[PDB]
Amino acid sequence: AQEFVNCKIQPGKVVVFIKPTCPYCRRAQEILSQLPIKQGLLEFVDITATNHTNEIQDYLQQLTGARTVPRVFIGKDCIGGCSDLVSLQQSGELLTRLKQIGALQ
């Protein structure tokens, strides 16, 4: 399953692949949704609701360098997982990363 993730991301959206069975996806949800971002851009896309985690996660491994979730895509740039997301929040690098894609408002 390649097209699901591939077509779900675009530039000029903050797409995030998640599963509700990751405790880490709940972190990323507050972490990201705490920040003032263009309405509709933050989209937590699911990897078990409508698909095959097992396939998509492996595809994400190839496409982004890691399979483990949450997996934040700030406008066709995968920033990494929640470990990286924490740096970019605390360092503030995330804010710059986002506003390029026309997010913060």
UniProtKB/Swiss-Prot annotation:
Q: Which cysteines are joined by disulfide bonds?
A: C22-C25, C78-C82
The GO terms describing molecular function are: glutathione disulfide oxidoreductase activity; sodium channel regulator activity
Q: Which PROSITE patterns match?
A: GLUTAREDOXIN_1, GLUTAREDOXIN_2
Instruction: For this UniProt record, give its keywords in alphabetical order, as a comma-separated list.
Output: Acetylation, Cytoplasm, Disulfide bond, Electron transport, Redox-active center, Transport
Is Cytoplasm included in the keywords of this UniProt record?
Answer: yes
Q: Which residues cross the membrane?
A: none
Q: Which InterPro entries match?
A: GLR_AS, GLRX1, Glutaredoxin, Glutaredoxin_euk/vir, Glutaredoxin_subgr, Thioredoxin-like_sf
- Cellular component, GO annotation: cytosol; extracellular exosome; nucleus
Residues modified as N6-succinyllysine: K8
Q: What is its main location?
A: cytoplasm
Where is the PTM N-acetylalanine found along the chain? A1
Supply one GO BP term. Answer: nucleobase-containing small molecule interconversion
All residue ranges annotated as the Glutaredoxin domain in the record: 2-105
Q: Gene3D superfamilies, per this entry?
A: Glutaredoxin (3.40.30.10)
Q: Where in the cell is it found?
A: Cytoplasm
Q: What family is it from?
A: Belongs to the glutaredoxin family.
This chain's function reads:
Has a glutathione-disulfide oxidoreductase activity in the presence of NADPH and glutathione reductase. Reduces low molecular weight disulfides and proteins.
The protein here is known as Glutaredoxin-1
Record lineage: Eukaryota, Metazoa, Chordata, Craniata, Vertebrata
